[PDB]
Amino acid sequence: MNNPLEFKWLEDFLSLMELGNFSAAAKARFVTQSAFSRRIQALEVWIGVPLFDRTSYPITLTEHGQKFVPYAENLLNQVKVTKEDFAQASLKTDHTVRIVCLHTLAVNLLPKLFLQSAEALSHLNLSVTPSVLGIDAHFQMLEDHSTDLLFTYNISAMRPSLSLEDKLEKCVIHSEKVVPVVAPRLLTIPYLSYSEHTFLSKVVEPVLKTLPLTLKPVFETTLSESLVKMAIGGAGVAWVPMHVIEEELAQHRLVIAFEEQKEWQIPIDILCYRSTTNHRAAVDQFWQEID
Template sequence: MELKWLEDFASLARTGSFSRSAEERHVTQSAFSRRIQALETWLGVALIDRSTYPTTLTAAGREFRETAEEAVRMLHGSRSALQASARPNAQVVAVAALHTLALTFFPRWFRQIEAATGPLSSRVLPDDFHNCIQAVAEGGYDFLLTFHHPSVPILLDPEHYPHRIVGADSLVPVCCAGLADESAALPLLSYPQTSFLGRVVIHAQARAGNPPAVIAHTNENAMAEALKFMALEGHGLAWLPRSLVARDLEDGRLIAVGEEAPLEIRLYRNAGHRRSTVSAVWQAAAAIAAKTMQDRNSPV
């Protein structure tokens, strides 16, 4: 049994809607439904009456609801207390960041932050889009550092999770130099279609001027870093953040073969975290972003 199953059930009991709870929990409706079914299988009873609309709880579901909600409260409360005792230093800032941003963007950006705030301790979670959002939404992390593209909305309440645009990147279709000379369609090295970058690529690939790719993927991986090395070895075409492949493009190891898809780099804050260190990082991020924008707009 997993904690997220209890959190899913508590959400569904409150909203009475699989679709609304799936949005709230940042998963697809089918994945959310499977998790509810997994909880029912573990308990050995049906919790949801699926013959009615809106969704209602069975007698067992009504009985279990209080237990589930109390278990979630106790576990989160215990986790918060343990984290507080383990990190007595209020100077620690916790950031959940997409893998690529943790590698390519965070180190230099955080050095700029420290130039404004003074030395800080940091705790970084490099993970995929869903897990990073969940880490911030569940209160374990102060900030979320993520890409953003208009085709993939980020379903975080702006009142509780405001954001700042702190940088820019792009997804560029690339392949190794040898494959770039071939006229045939290239094998596609892809992200899972339900992942953040996978959904952006679907949108970008549909635009005119972008290269074709065979339907049969030679590799699927949620990590852009893994796809980069597949592309370098000549396995096919991959859509990769320019920040990740800039040096490879300069050196000619990879060739850009289509239009790029622009990406924002956004910093989301858990507004419920009001420590002075969190506020200082937030203010410094705004100042750095404003200076960066001013420098870009200044005439050469």
């Protein structure tokens, strides 16, 4: 089960039909002339007959290519209509702003931002979900406009893929440190860690061999807010972003470990991304406020 139709071939066929020239069509499809010739060939293998005569000038349709024209458009339009009909299903209303961020930004940063701008945003219905699908999946949704903004850290692992950068705008929301914290009682030490897969594990783990203490891992999760609850409860040392523990540091239920050894801290920037082509007014009024 692996000779499937690839829809890209349908556009390749339409482009060569219209332009009559392998070099021009490849350019219009953003691929090398060889990539493009191979794709047309793969289409012809799949449909089973040659669609183009290469011995005429310019390239023309065969008898079979003529017959195939309505089949190519028919499918291409069905995919388009499918994409368009469901593009609006994400939108409750045209004044709702769809937002994806790290869980700890969904609980600490985003409400603080709306609440501070509550009057200037009072007409907007924010819809806030945490990042859970994988960084590339969420950026694809941003580019497709099924998501309006994306709040991330400026870590390497949360960068948008290189092919996508040109299509996105980003602004900095503020700067921060990831710092180690414990409850007042302090001295081997119980370690409260990020699961090795998630984004913050890669920021913190290199810093940790510089550490002089042996670390007794007793709890790992993916969410900073979970580590914070255990650090409060006296369970170990965790690395957490500062603007997760503001009042906790004030109430002295937590305190920074080796406070004046700033190189066991990691500076990070909170980023907000949008698609340059997403011109929905509700999204624009929101972006104007936090930027």
